[PDB]
Design a protein around this ligand. Sequence first.
Ligand SMILES: CCCCCCCCCCCCO[C@@H]1O[C@H](CO)[C@@H](O[C@H]2O[C@H](CO)[C@@H](O)[C@H](O)[C@H]2O)[C@H](O)[C@H]1O
Ligand code: SF4
Lengths: 174, 155, 83, 97, 70, 51, 96, 98, 318, 115, 114
Amino acid sequence: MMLYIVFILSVIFVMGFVGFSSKPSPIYGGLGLIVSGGVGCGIVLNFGGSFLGLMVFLIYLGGMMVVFGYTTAMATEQYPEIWLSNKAVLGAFVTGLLMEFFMVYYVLKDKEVEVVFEFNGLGDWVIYDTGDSGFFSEEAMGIAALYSYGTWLVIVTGWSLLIGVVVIMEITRG
Amino acid sequence: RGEYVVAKLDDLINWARRSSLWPMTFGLACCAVEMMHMAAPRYDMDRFGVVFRASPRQSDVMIVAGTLTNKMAPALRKVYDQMPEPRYVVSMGSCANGGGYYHYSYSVVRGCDRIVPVDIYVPGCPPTAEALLYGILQLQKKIKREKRLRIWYRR
Amino acid sequence: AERVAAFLKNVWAKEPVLVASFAIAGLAVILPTLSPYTKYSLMINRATPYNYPVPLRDDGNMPDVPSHPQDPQGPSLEWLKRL
Amino acid sequence: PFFDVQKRLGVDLDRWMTIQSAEQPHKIPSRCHAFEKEWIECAHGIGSIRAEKECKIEFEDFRECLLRQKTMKRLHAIRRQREKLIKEGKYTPPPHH
Amino acid sequence: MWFEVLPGIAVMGVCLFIPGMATARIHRFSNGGKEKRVAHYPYQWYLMERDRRVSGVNRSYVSKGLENID
Amino acid sequence: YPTKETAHWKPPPWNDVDPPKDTLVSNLTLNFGPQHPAAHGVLRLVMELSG
Amino acid sequence: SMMKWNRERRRLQIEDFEARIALMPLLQAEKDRRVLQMLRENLEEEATVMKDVPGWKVGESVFHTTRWVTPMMGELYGLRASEEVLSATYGFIWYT
Amino acid sequence: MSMVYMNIMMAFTVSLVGLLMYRSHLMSSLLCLEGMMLSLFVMAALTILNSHFTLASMMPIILLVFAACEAALGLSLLVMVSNTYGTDYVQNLNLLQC
Amino acid sequence: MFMINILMLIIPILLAVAFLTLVERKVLGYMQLRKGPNVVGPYGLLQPIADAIKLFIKEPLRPATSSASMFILAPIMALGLALTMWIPLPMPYPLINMNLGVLFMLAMSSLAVYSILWSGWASNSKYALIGALRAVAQTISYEVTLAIILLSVLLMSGSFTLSTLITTQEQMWLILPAWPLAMMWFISTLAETNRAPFDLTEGESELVSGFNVEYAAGPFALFFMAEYANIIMMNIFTAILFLGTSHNPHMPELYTINFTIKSLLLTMSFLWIRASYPRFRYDQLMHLLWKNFLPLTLALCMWHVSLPILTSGIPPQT
Amino acid sequence: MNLMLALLTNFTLATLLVIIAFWLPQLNVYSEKTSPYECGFDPMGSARLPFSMKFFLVAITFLLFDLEIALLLPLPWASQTANLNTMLTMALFLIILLAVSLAYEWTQKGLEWTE
Amino acid sequence: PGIVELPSLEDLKVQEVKVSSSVLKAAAHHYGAQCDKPNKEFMLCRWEEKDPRRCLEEGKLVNQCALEFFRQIKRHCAEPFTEYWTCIDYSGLQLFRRCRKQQAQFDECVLDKL
Ligand SMILES: CCCCCCCCCCCCO[C@@H]1O[C@H](CO)[C@@H](O[C@H]2O[C@H](CO)[C@@H](O)[C@H](O)[C@H]2O)[C@H](O)[C@H]1O
Ligand code: SF4
């Protein structure tokens, strides 16, 4: 059951998505986007994405905090909706979860499922790299290279953020 | 023997409760000043474990320290009801004890025991800081005599 | 240029945090040039061997490549030892 | 590109990451480096119309090295047969399996 | 007096010293008296997994030396 | 081409400045005291607050 | 002080890395034999599992090219106890 | 494809359906946007981390940089929509029908 | 034997926290010309054990308007995450050795803030909500500066590993080559831990306990335990970053001695700072972090990018 | 396994304390005890009414600044590159570009809360 | 596609070098100098061929040279050596730094014996 960690985490990843995609109050929607973002670290972490896993988690953590601040200010209501207090949200939540359960049951039972496209259920471990042994994480080398190689990416991203600050000033100040 | 076990689990919880009373920060009038003096360096209520806490939910004891007017009565009963059990009320001063020097007024409640159940009555107008401390230590001896578990074992 | 030499006093009077930060920033952008040691940093990062140093197929035309690791050809790091 | 300025000005703005067989930091090789390199050399200079028909073998291998779709069906068949013979008590694994 | 605050600090300190002392003792206990091997990079893991095979008892912390060469 | 489903559409403003609403973006009303350390024990300070 | 100490730490890192460069030929020789050893065992104990299957060719490559293709964890550890697979797969990531 | 993809892509599709099916609050529809990029983030990393294609390890990072920019750009527009109507409801944004 | 090692970590932490609630009361008393607890046991040594027992046999009130699930969820998440930010800490051997320890600590301190946000929201009370949103304002104030200040110091260590910081500081502490970052790091730890002068999410003189004004008994203790566990953790992390202690593998205990001493002296300075200053206004907190610390934190980040390059003292990746 | 056990133990303990906290004491619940707290007087309106955000602009800019720090954490590794000329220039370019972004926001009165 | 060619388990057999990691690291700077010809010849083949099934005989001569290296240590001064790698073995990171006093014995002995 430990050889299927990456599958179990992915299942929770989807379950978290159905939580906020059915769209309850943004308070619980953000909660489901925190769980998906944390097990998103888990999936990326098992593949060797230690830095990448923690960066999406850390970035999405501060992102939802601002969304919680904004929800109380602008997207609230006397009776915040949860997944069990609205026929439309409960329908979306149940429709999503059942759709996932049938995927999990079939892929596990038959070691393969064909939800439109063929997927192989032997386990995610079958594809990993067998060999490696260097004093470094190839992930960090790639990210660290952003400054010696990706000069062009640095400029367009850095410029976009600077224009991003000017943009939000103009938009809000009317 | 079970009677022994409850006798020592009841000494215990009584010790815990009396050794850590957190009064609600709540003073109505003059008598609040002597209540500050009980917390001031000379008497140091903190050395006994007593710590004022603003929220009623985090409080154990209500010291009624001042006159209770008819306007104030609904609020004193609201905050009292919002204290988790077990909760104890200390009536401090003559105004809280029984109207005191506004007893015959039209806007005063003639004793806080008309509104909340009182455990200790500290007399004085105001009770000196040491007289209030005598009352608090008298409440601790009252908790020390409670027998919740001993009475449950014989239910 | 007394106008700026007095403009420094005013800002130094009102907002010394900005004065400190800009001066620190200026040095972070300027001293890299004016240093006899900035060249070494490149040298040392290129002396750290992360991969295998793969051997060449000797063909009798490359007397500049040492036949043994303890041979007196190839590059030295004695500059790094005594650095 | 639509306006192929990069080749005109000789500045590599973004070609260095388009393929995974390019120069990489510390000469770390990609897993399917050889499978890509062969497909790129085979189909270089002949155009996509000819490449889609002439370099088919190299691209099929490259596609195989990436998504291992054929490798995992072979593995799946072996496990499915093996887990069938065990349930029938016909096959015995050695100590090292 | 201020020195009557020290009994609390002592009990605190001796509670903060235990977490670090237990880790060193247990790591030493469960690795044959040696520090737990650190593997920050795939290379050290390879050497670790190799030590486990070279040990012949499936413990990576059991070290074989010259006496093991034949 | 007028239609029942467009019988209530109206021409837009001349300058494209739809009139401002009269939404009662009301404030939060909070009881500050009596039971409050800063209220001196007997002050009910009602406060309309914008944030 | 952080100049001198960091320079020293760089010389200690070079020393650590050189030692690795001395032993890599040995660990590469062992790794080659280990990989081939495991593949041969899988093949031997995979012709017997599927002797009764029609159309199966034991050991047939999925790749048209005859080049040597590094096996993935599934091929190399396909028929082994989950004890070994888990250590081989997530052992390093999960180590502490 | 591997069985991890079956669920990462199933996450993207749900968040896409979630976006295309509005309810009331505009905020909720901005969280579906963020849901997509998260799934797109995870999908890229697995492919890039598994292929050992190192130089694209900076790709998921650059994805996040412009992900928050749309989050920022959306929240700027949601503030101005709220100030006008006191709510983020999308039903109110219907002046331009005519 | 790992599970035994977790308990030898968790249990002392709870005991240390229980008695930091006594050392604090005592130090604040003597700094105020009084005595603090000295009745309930010799020198008030049993005062923590009457606090703790009393809270757990007191009925816990779940507000009528509260959201039951997330009201209960929030406290568990607080004490749960507070104990987690200890496992990477090297003392001198960490429970879990992480190649990215410092990030994992930033990530957990970001996720910990959602205990306050949900507890205040789940309370469905105006004072709870007002305090809960003072946690939002506070996090926006210190996170950008907290991350950069950490970054500017790792450019001297050369890695995110927390144990590597010990090898970095084997000659001299990092408070000599970075006393400006240290000064700002200390302030941001106060604001991260919600400690005076930055105790704005509770603000008793303002909001009557703030975010946890509806909690009682055990659920309220878990918020009180969690906050004090983070005081110790952030000062243990502070003793590592800037006051590196020398580690001797053959006699590791000596590290823990000098290490614990430095984390009590820092943990005392939180207590000392509480008795000495008034409270900030939560809008004056962002201007402190954004219009003073942040400009100087950016300027020192460029400085600590240049300095290793223009002096040849770039630390090893290892 | 070692890390997951640490997480499982940490949160199980918290859950056990909350479980003991809720089932151990003697409960006595009635309508007035559980009413929302607001200093002894009945609250006016809901706690779920809108609560204006006066730092709404700074909160947005936090997201973008939050992303910058994610572009700078690779810096300790980026300094180990043999191509230090390019790294240093592009490193001081993001920080200065970030610094300018703060200057424009600061000067244009974007940091000051609305009134 | 054809049958993946594979060597016989007979020809994959060699007398392995069974000395733990600390033994190798402690005897690495000398190993690099003494067994550099079979090692560098094997490694050149290993990139040149890009196939492990080819460079197998050369992967034997790497082992046999390693065994001879550790044998010369055993015959002469294996006591300064065992005093050395036991100090490397102790460290969690196996640090050369924490044992320069035990290293000088081993270094100077081979500078006399061999
Ligand atoms: C609004 C946009 C603002 C963007 C601001 C960007 C400012 C960047 C200023 C340059 C920073 C780096 O400055 C540059 O660094 C390198 C090494 O790192 C320095 O040092 C180098 O110079 C020469 C180059 O052949 C050599 O001696 C050696 O490679 C090295 O010492 C250079 O002297 C300097 O030109
Ligand atoms: S009892 Fe005396 S001191 Fe107290 S409030 Fe009444 S008049 Fe004032």
